[PDB]
Design a protein around this ligand. Structure first.
Ligand code: GPP
Ligand code: GPP
Ligand code: MG
Lengths: 218, 209
């Protein structure tokens, strides 16, 4: 069984306020922690490590906040892109061109033959995703099929495991469209405080679960 | 003007725990759901959503589908006279007998009640999107957030979502247009849920913001 993993990052402002440090340093710690998380996910045999980078609404923040966040996320790819396959998707039209250009170049320079993939999803929002798909195919086809929908969703496959640190038990705009049976794990520990042990007990929890897919066992 | 959504789970597990049949466990679920509707109404929620089934659920055996659909329909048989009942979802995968009875019960419900019980059947974001597209294909210049919200299975954003039974997952029950929904999971099986469990769940959900 080949599994994949998805991380929902949040709590950089909470960590910066809690520590009495700047938002920029909090995001630098987020970059370090995300490099760590990518390493851990690769060590644990996950085929793809998904990171829900941002929602559409996040790009309504101030220019500086968007620059800091997008730079922090991009630095992860700058550091690890040489040894893995990098890809990205989402509501790309709301992402500033600077980051689309740099992330495209980094995607071109990544090892597309690697057995491990880091995938960023930016501008996540089920409303915008569905509206984009509908408008793309509106009137041009007799009916939308599961295959087309799967081929045009932001996340190109069902997600197996989903982890959200930071104490919020909610999905926000990050729920994957084609993942009805994804397993969810929440923990109060902030992302920048997550240790390898926290990750490991999370994986104990997630791998302990019996996956039914809506059916009774046989 | 708040609403609540319940994801039922733990009927087979409860039947095994109590040493009873699946039908008996689902009868206990019927009683428990009548109770839950009462609790939700007393707490001021305008609409109580219950995720009856997913698309995958109808791939179960005929006996299992009949047991579940009968218990859920029995809830409406008991409560339809005192509240407003409505339903939605991927209706084409629901057996016609149950759609017929549920439609008749919806027509007989109190459409003037300030409280609504709403079943969603055959839940699946893929099938929901496919159905919306097929419904509006070529009939509109472009899909808007307003139209999408007006035609999704759940017709409004969900405030609170509760899943007892110990499984931390949506199992195809995620409400499409609820980006700000708060989720509460608890290990207590649905059939073991008391009013106090509901109340502390509401404490947890209301403490957050
Ligand atoms: C393009 C942009 C702006 C991306 C935003 C990056 C992000 C995941 C912020 C969430 O953390 P938070 O600081 O908002 O959480 P908290 O307030 O709890 O610290
Ligand atoms: C039409 C159908 C089949 C509806 C199914 C409704 C449902 C998800 C019940 C959950 O309890 P359960 O039956 O899965 O019990 P348990 O959690 O113990 O397996
Ligand atoms: Mg179940």
């Amino acid at each position: 069984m080949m599994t994949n993993l998805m991380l929902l990052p949040d709590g950089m402002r909470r960590w910066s306020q809690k520590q009495g440090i700047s938002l920029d340093d909090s995001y630098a710690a987020m970059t370090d922690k995300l490099v760590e998380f990518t390493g851990w996910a690769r060590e644990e045999g996950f085929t793809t490590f998904y990171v829900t980078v941002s929602s559409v609404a996040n790009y309504s923040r101030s220019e500086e906040q968007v620059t800091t966040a997008m730079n922090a996320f991009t630095e992860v790819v700058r550091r690890c892109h040489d040894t893995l396959n990098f890809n990205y998707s989402g509501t790309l039209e709301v992402v500033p061109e600077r980051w689309l250009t740099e992330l495209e170049a980094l995607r071109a320079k990544s090892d597309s033959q690697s057995d491990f993939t880091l995938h960023f999803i930016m501008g996540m929002s089920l409303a915008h995703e569905v509206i984009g798909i509908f408008n793309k195919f509106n009137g041009k086809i007799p009916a939308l099929t599961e295959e087309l929908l799967a081929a045009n969703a932001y996340v190109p496959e069902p997600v197996d495991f989903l982890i959200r640190p930071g104490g919020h038990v909610r999905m926000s705009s990050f729920y994957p469209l084609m993942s009805p049976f994804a397993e969810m794990y929440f923990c109060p520990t902030l992302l920048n405080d997550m240790t390898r042990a926290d990750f490991d007990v999370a994986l104990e929890d997630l791998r302990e679960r019996d996956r039914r897919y809506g059916l009774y066992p046989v």
